[PDB]
Amino acid sequence: MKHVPPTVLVWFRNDLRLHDHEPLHRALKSGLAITAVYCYDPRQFAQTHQGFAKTGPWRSNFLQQSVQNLAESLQKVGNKLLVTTGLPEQVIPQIAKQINAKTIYYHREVTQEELDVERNLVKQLTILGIEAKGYWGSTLCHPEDLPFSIQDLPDLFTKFRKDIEKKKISIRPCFFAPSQLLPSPNIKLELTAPPPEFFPQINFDHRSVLAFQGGETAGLARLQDYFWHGDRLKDYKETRNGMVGADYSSKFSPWLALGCLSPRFIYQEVKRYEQERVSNDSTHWLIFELLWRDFFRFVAQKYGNKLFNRGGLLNKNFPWQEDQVRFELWRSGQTGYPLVDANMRELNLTGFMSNRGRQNVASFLCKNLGIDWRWGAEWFESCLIDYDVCSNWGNWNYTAGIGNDARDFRYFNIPKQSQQYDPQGTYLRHWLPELKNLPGDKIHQPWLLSATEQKQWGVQLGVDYPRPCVNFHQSVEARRKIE
Ligand SMILES: Cc1cc2nc3c(=O)[nH]c(=O)nc-3n(C[C@@H](O)[C@H](O)[C@@H](O)COP(=O)(O)OP(=O)(O)OC[C@H]3O[C@@H](n4cnc5c(N)ncnc54)[C@H](O)[C@@H]3O)c2cc1C
After folding, report:
1. CA distances from 126 to 104, 123, 130 (A)
2. Across the chain, which distance is largest between two alpha carbons, in Å?
3. What residues contact 199, with CB distance under 8 A and at least 6 apart?
4. Which of 365, 391, 396 to mutate to test the pocket of ligand 1 (most atoms within 8 A of CB)?
5. What's the 441 CA to ligand 1 centre distance in angstroms?
6. Which of ligand 1's atoms lies nearest the C-alpha of 253?
7. Superfamily name with CATH number, domain 303-482
8. What keywords were assigned to this record?
9. What is the atom index within ligand 1 of the atom nearest the CA of 381?
10. Ligand 1 first shell, C-beta below 6 A
11. Of 104, 139, 410, 453, which residue is most buried, by most CB within 10 angstroms?
12. In what helix (H) or strand (E) does residue 8 lie, and over which residues does it extend?
């Protein structure tokens, strides 16, 4: 009965921030009262094909904290975040009709699940005579500024990278976070708080690289610490392949995945750092990594569902084992290969794994165990606190040899990698307590321990730590034999 003035609605998904947010910026420039909404989608809390929770505890809790921080940032600027649950394509249009929204502003995604949601949502808006404005803001490089169409995206990262830089594409400046956002008059809406079961209680492990806190505020603080307070960006290139501690890399991933941090804002800060403190290979290398992120997003956009097919991007068959027992050995980190086990346990207990670790465990599953690569991609999807559909599935495709041609079989020598990237065994002892008594480099290959060593050091293979589940050289040559 009360008068409901026309308004605009900003729909949030994986862009939980107020800074450099084009949809939000365009909305406020309309000059109308703004309503903000986040809708927890039950489908994201169901399961993957092999049964894993689609959104595990590490990420669901990080998400809840990110949504909560966004609600607090909006309250701070005199507005509020409407939080509800259900199918967005159903809920958002319902809210829009009720609040008399004239337009919905949102960020566009590129993968099937996300694409169907926004597509069906817009269809409902169109039926109601409500406009929908979507923007591209997930990538460092705007799709419209690329020297080529998505369909023409080069298949080699190097060419992609060289083409964009050797063209001076230029990065769009960041939009400013608003200090005030006019809210519409109070309107009674039926909002459903998300079910508690979506966020199972978490047992934080202090061995974690970081006490990850979801949200834009925590994301900005982390950048502040890594870049400025700690002044460690200058050494990024030298420490990026590390595995122990919070500072061997930015740890920006979970915040970038939910859009708590804009990649263009990070880029902006890298440039500030380069001008104020130092410009070297490290400062440039971090940008290279953001480009890899962009690349996989465009690859996912270009290839669509092929990204999730058995044959991946290259549509290459390859036989794969469906050994559930061996897979659980991998997932639980009881393969008998310390580098792999330490990494898998870190993931299981913290939701995070270093890039160097991810490359090795993925290779071990595909090349050494020869198990359906998708099973590994699914576990990462479930367990990773920084899961990004494009980067995860894209990287798994490459590792499995179904994404990047490269006329040559490729595998990681786990035992070699272990000694090279954890020369003192620090990472290993950090995550594998049972091997803490091993004082020497045999910690990298415990199967080399003599009967005397196993007894003296209290490490009985088969009891305290598992025997290698596979012969390394043999497994590699066997999987390769699949020509
Ligand atoms: C099997 C496998 C699965 C992966 N799954 C994911 C995933 O779900 N989500 C995700 O964000 N990354 C994934 N990656 C890349 C991964 O290594 C993470 O980016 C992580 O290591 C980031 O930690 P950091 O933020 O400290 O990285 P930094 O080294 O500090 O790099 C900074 C940012 O660059 C981006 N980046 C770095 N390396 C890559 C890369 N290889 N591909 C894409 N972006 C990259 C990330 O957004 C990252 O936050 C995967 C890699 C492999 C080999």
Report:
1. 11, 5, 6
2. 85
3. 57, 60, 61, 64
4. 391
5. 29
6. 49
7. DNA Cyclobutane Dipyrimidine Photolyase, subunit A, domain 3 (1.10.579.10)
8. Chromophore, DNA-binding, FAD, Flavoprotein, Repressor, Transcription, Transcription regulation
9. 8
10. 240, 249-253, 256-257, 286, 289-290, 292-293, 296, 354-355, 358-359, 362, 380, 384, 386-388, 391-392, 395-396, 399
11. 104
12. strand 7-12
Solved by what technique? X-ray
CATH 1.10.579.10 domain extents, the chain:
303-482
Q: What residue spans in the chain does CATH classification 3.40.50.620 cover?
A: 6-137
Q: How big, in percent rounded to 5, are the helix, strand and coil portions of the chain?
A: 50, 10, 40
Residues of the chain within CATH 1.25.40.80 domain(s) are 141-169+213-302
How far lies 271's CA from each of 90, 278, 283, 293, in Å?
42, 10, 8, 18
| Spatial contact of 402 and 312, defined as CB atoms under 8 Å apart | yes
Nearest to 190 by CA among 95, 289, 326, 288: 95
Task: Check if the beta carbon of residue 61 is closer than 8 Å to that of residue 202.
Answer: yes
Identity of the residue numbered 132: A
In angstroms, this model's resolution equals 1.9
Instruction: Report how far residue 455's alpha carbon sits from residue 145's, in angstroms, rounded to the nearest whole number.
Output: 64
Q: Determine the distance separating the centroid of ligand 1 and the alpha carbon of 164, expressed in angstroms.
A: 21
Query: Which residue's structure tokens are 């199972």?
Result: 200
107-128: buried (b, 16+ CB within 10 Å) or exposed (e) per residue?
bbbbbeebeebbeebbebbeee
The CA 79 to ligand 1 mean position distance, Å, reads: 34
Helix (H, G, I), strand (E, B) or coil at 10: strand
Ligand 1 center from residue 179 Cα (angstroms) = 32
The highest-level CATH class for domain 6-137 is alpha beta
CA–CA separation, 41 vs 254, rounded Å? 19
Of 4, 65, 59, give the one whose Cα is nearest residue 38.
Answer: 65
- What does CATH list as the number for 141-169+213-302? 1.25.40.80
